[PDB]
Amino acid sequence: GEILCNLCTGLINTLENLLTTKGADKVKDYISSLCNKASGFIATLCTKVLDFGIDKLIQLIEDKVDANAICAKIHAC
Description:
By secondary structure, this protein is mainly α. The protein has helices at residues 5-18, 25-35, 43-52, 54-63, 67-74. It has a single domain (1-77), classed as NK-Lysin (Orthogonal Bundle). Helix 1 packs antiparallel against helix 2. Residues 1-77 form the Saposin B-type domain.
């Protein structure tokens, strides 16, 4: 893989400092803009997170799921 993980796993980590308090709405707002750059091999990768749940990815972290484990999850690496 290693297509655009740095992007995901990179943003994921940002989600940890993003809001994680305000509401977590701006998360899907920012994750969209970012995820809004696939339309290709990541196509399914993008819809992957959506299919999974942007909030979910954040939920995993809450538990103890790194930005990678959370990524590799939906298969982004």
